[PDB]
């Protein structure tokens, strides 16, 4: 179902044991525990609780669960956020994500008026020191273009100005 180069992947970004997660193709499913507990906190893991709620309509819920959950986890902690799409949409999501982001991310809005839905790109880098930051960012964008992205893969277009 998911081509093998589009599956999310870890990749040793340094001599540190901490590898970095590359989901360039938006294929990390939120319910998937394979890559660790990215989504869902441990502030509820063993808290005793009892809660009752009205479920959203099922089809509606299905089609927004992954984007909304993934955005909320990733976009809270990123240091660089790119929003790609129509002016109407990148604006709408800049206000959503400026609010959400807890790490003073830099925002870049890439306007593409042919994109019927916006696309966010979330980068978080490990750990003068401002020059280091810039070089790290350039290496992640290179590792995604050269290594992970196929030449004509269209999801990758906001990574390669």
């Amino acid at each position: 179902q998911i081509p093998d180069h589009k599956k999310p992947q870890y990749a040793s970004v340094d001599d540190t044991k901490t590898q970095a997660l590359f989901d360039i193709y938006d294929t990390l499913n939120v319910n998937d525990k394979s890559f660790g507990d990215w989504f869902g906190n441990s502030a509820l893991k063993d808290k005793t609780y009892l809660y009752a709620m009205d479920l959203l309509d099922y089809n509606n819920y299905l089609s927004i669960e992954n984007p909304i959950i993934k955005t909320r986890a990733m976009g809270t902690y990123a240091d660089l956020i790119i929003i790609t799409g129509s002016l109407e949409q990148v604006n709408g999501y800049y206000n959503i994500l400026k609010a959400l982001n807890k790490r003073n991310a830099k925002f870049v809005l890439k306007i593409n008026e042919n994109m019927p839905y916006a696309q966010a790109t979330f980068l978080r880098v490990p750990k003068d020191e401002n020059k280091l930051f810039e070089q790290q960012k350039r290496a992640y964008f290179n590792y995604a273009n050269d290594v992970i992205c196929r030449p004509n893969d269209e999801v990758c277009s906001p990574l390669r100005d």
């Binding site: 970004v13 360039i24 660790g36 063993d46 005793t48 009892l50 709620m53 099922y58 959950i69 978080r124």
Partner: protein, 88 residues
């Protein structure tokens, strides 16, 4: 979302819905996920059809085969009510 995996570097792209839809339903989507992800007992009350669909989506091809699901079919009721409980 807030985890001890937030020491870890990442680079993730997301294909977003219409931001007006995000605004309208993000808070409730987060509840639902928060509650099924961590819960040990889920109870679903609603139309016999809708609750079976949710029980299966929630079970994730067995990534949540450890949740104890309890279905209660109804009739004159529009919607599905979830009751999630946890315990140590």
């Amino acid at each position: 979302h807030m985890d001890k995996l937030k020491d870890t570097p990442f680079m993730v792209q997301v294909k977003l819905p219409n931001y007006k839809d995000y605004l309208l339903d993000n808070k409730q989507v987060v509840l639902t996920f928060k509650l099924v992800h961590h819960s040990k007992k889920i109870t679903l009350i609603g139309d016999a059809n809708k609750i079976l669909q949710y029980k299966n989506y929630f079970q994730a091809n067995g990534a949540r085969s450890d949740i104890d699901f309890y279905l209660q079919p109804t009739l004159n009721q529009k919607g599905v009510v979830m009751i999630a409980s946890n315990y140590n």
